Amino acid sequence: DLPCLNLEPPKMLKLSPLLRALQDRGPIHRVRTPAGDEAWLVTRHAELKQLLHDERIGRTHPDPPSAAQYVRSPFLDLLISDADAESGRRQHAETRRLLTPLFSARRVLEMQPKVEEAADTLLDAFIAQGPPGDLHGELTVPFALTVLCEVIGVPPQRRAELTTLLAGIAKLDDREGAVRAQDDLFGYVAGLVEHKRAEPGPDIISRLNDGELTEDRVAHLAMGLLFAGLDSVASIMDNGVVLLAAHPDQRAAALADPDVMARAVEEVLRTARAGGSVLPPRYASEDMEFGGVTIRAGDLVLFDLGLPNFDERAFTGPEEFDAARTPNPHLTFGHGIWHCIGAPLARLELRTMFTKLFTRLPELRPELPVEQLRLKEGQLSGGFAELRVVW
Ligand SMILES: C[C@@H]1C/C=C/C=C/C=C/C=C/[C@H](O[C@@H]2O[C@H](C)[C@@H](O)[C@H](N)[C@@H]2O)C[C@@H]2O[C@](O)(C[C@@H](O)C/C=C/C=C/C(=O)O1)C[C@H](O)[C@H]2C(=O)O
Ligand code: HEM
């Protein structure tokens, strides 16, 4: 009898009864996943943060095609190899050395004008169209994609076509459709990488080509970035709009002052999804005794960021949306060597759009009561199916 996890959408600002019960009853539990496999679930902020620094947990497994999974995704399968634990950790460290400088404070400051231009253009169009409008499909997804394309070096005309492909690679209910979407996207990206070698621009693909990587790895890094920076930004943005609409005093504080806005963006990150934010699978590379249990070599270890983010051991009043919360040690961008390398751009995108959205549309709010918002099914990182708003 292992507790069995599900894919039900979370409620606003509150862990589900199963997740609250597991967090109350200890820091780590053997569970069953939506795919039907067994896993460890870590439920508290201190212990999760401690596993994020434990080099026994990583993206290697002796036998990747029989490894326990949370959901079945040919995209996530690309992440796991049968390299030994040291060689995997080496691969990963090299990856971080190359991606980390692409988002330096200087480079992020240089990105700002185009992030702000893109938000203006899209918000003009959204507003021209008049209420009600699908915030998700017509604003947050296209803004995150536009920004990402500009930074990575994908031409803007490709935006409609990537929206389709990046949805395709994330299908959970259609293995062949997902493999095919992956082949097509990769074929496009690999063509783009080759173009850029002949004609470099101030963009990530060129910066990665200026180094010692194979064509193949440059393409894989670019494709991973395109998937990592799209629906994540949209999810945090969609939920921040819901939360900020629902908390008028908090919103007013945020818009009144750019330092409350910077704090408010961290509180949106902490509270956007109260559960269900389960990261790509990681595995123990050897047995380890942790949190009163013995994790075995090969066991799946799951990180659901809602759990630590709502842990009352780490946060005073974790169910309260406090736009001024400081400090705010949320784990929404991960930590340690599993830490978001795009976080500086994501934060810029969030401050930029929250500010413009609520400045221009002070009364912006979802049309439906929150409990009637519908989540996309059968899609990795799927977020809302639509987010109709009025103003
Ligand atoms: C080069 C590689 C390639 C990319 C792999 C991407 C994995 C994405 C996982 C998203 C998972 C999750 O998606 C979920 O999938 C379930 C099936 C659904 O039933 C849920 N409805 C939800 O859509 C968690 C999401 O996470 C977020 O979006 C953050 C999420 O990027 C963090 C993952 C970073 C991965 C980096 C990485 O390896 O770089 C916020 C989002 O707020 C969070 C969330 O939605 O709760
Ligand atoms: C607010 C939106 C975002 C959120 C919530 C988020 C969150 C995360 C998290 C939790 C991780 C750790 C994943 C893991 O350990 O499995 C991660 C890693 C990563 N993120 Fe983000 N991210 C966001 C936006 C972005 C953007 C805009 C980019 C790129 C332009 C990006 C690029 C990456 C990459 C390349 C990694 C893997 C880094 C590594 O291999 O260690 N992310 N992100």
Automatic annotation (TrEMBL):
Phylogenetic classification of the source organism: Bacteria, Bacillati, Actinomycetota, Actinomycetes, Kitasatosporales
Protein name as it appears in the record: PimD protein
Keywords carried by this UniProt record: Heme, Iron, Metal-binding, Monooxygenase, Oxidoreductase
Organism: Streptomyces natalensis
Binding site residues for heme b 1: R59, H92, R96, R282, C340
Family the entry assigns: Belongs to the cytochrome P450 family.
Coiled-coil region: none
Entry-linked InterPro entries: Cyt_P450, Cyt_P450_B, Cyt_P450_sf
Protein residues bound to heme b 2: H92, R96, R282, C340
